[PDB]
């Protein structure tokens, strides 16, 4: 027969990893605001996301598709002031 007592610890491990990953999916989605995560993001993507923050008012990954930008977009430009690499 199939020894179920031998499979109980395997079942415990399997349920633990499965539940942990499911809870991590829900937390990541909740942190993202209802969309999946962005993975393998290059410099281009980081800059696009910064521009998105300038456009949607700092609301994370929220997207706007209006053709014309609000007025504050022209003034909320950011350069970065980086300390001397001694």
């Amino acid at each position: 027969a199939i020894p179920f007592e031998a499979l109980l610890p395997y079942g415990i491990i399997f349920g633990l990893l499965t539940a942990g990953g499911g809870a991590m999916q829900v937390l990541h989605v909740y942190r993202n605001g209802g969309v999946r995560d962005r993975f393998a993001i290059d410099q281009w993507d980081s800059q696009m996301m910064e521009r998105d923050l300038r456009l949607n008012g700092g609301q994370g990954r929220k997207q706007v598709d209006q053709a014309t930008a609000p007025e504050a977009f022209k003034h909320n430009h950011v350069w970065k002031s980086e300390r001397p690499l001694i």
Partner: protein, 60 residues
């Protein structure tokens, strides 16, 4: 790649506009600080006539 190429001109153009504004703005700020002193703020440190966005700010 082709999508990114098609987006690059407008994004660049915006960035050039921001560059010109912030470079000029810093020029007037420094000039205003240097009024009353015998120093030329408009003189580039470079010998070519080319536009040179500032590097190296003062710490804020």
């Amino acid at each position: 790649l082709w999508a990114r190429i098609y987006l690059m001109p407008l994004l660049q153009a915006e960035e050039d506009r921001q560059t010109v504004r912030r470079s000029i703005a810093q020029l007037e700020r420094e000039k205003e600080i240097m009024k009353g002193t015998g120093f030329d703020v408009d003189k580039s440190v470079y010998n070519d006539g080319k536009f040179h966005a500032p590097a190296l700010m003062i710490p804020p």
